Amino acid sequence: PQITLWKRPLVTIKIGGQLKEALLDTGADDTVLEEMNLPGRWKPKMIGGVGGFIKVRQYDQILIEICGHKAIGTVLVGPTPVNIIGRNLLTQIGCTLNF
């Protein structure tokens, strides 16, 4: 599909057997999701943005379905105000910017 940017590009995603709304975010290097109790091993990480840094948990090889498109890769989990799909998974679903 084509998504215009008049409003926030929120789409439904499916992760860990759960449906969530997440932002398709070309400005985010890596996908970061609101705090959730994923199983598995993880590694601490810090990501920086407007306002400074937050601490997150980095999970590797996590399957996310984004609008029916499957993807698998790094998912970070931490106190973000919004679920964010970053470039690491956007490439995997064939997402481009166009103008």
Added chain:
Amino acid sequence: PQITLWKRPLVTIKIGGQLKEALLDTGADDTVLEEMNLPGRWKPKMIGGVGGFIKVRQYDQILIEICGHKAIGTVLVGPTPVNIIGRNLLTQIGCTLNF
């Protein structure tokens, strides 16, 4: 153009007669640029991102050319980690997400 997302979508912009590099950021409602002198009146404002809130100067109805396309809109200037072009300007240049 069509821009893939294996790398950061960085583009050259021109603002205040000056060239800069900025990030096309579909996750940003607003456009925030690093500290710079811009002519015209400005109002102090607060904006929040992943890490908290920062003080910025809001410039309204500013001319800014993004990878060859002209926009005239609101630009926030302050201690952002990188220059980010948000939806208020991405819409003006006809930018969409496609997959």
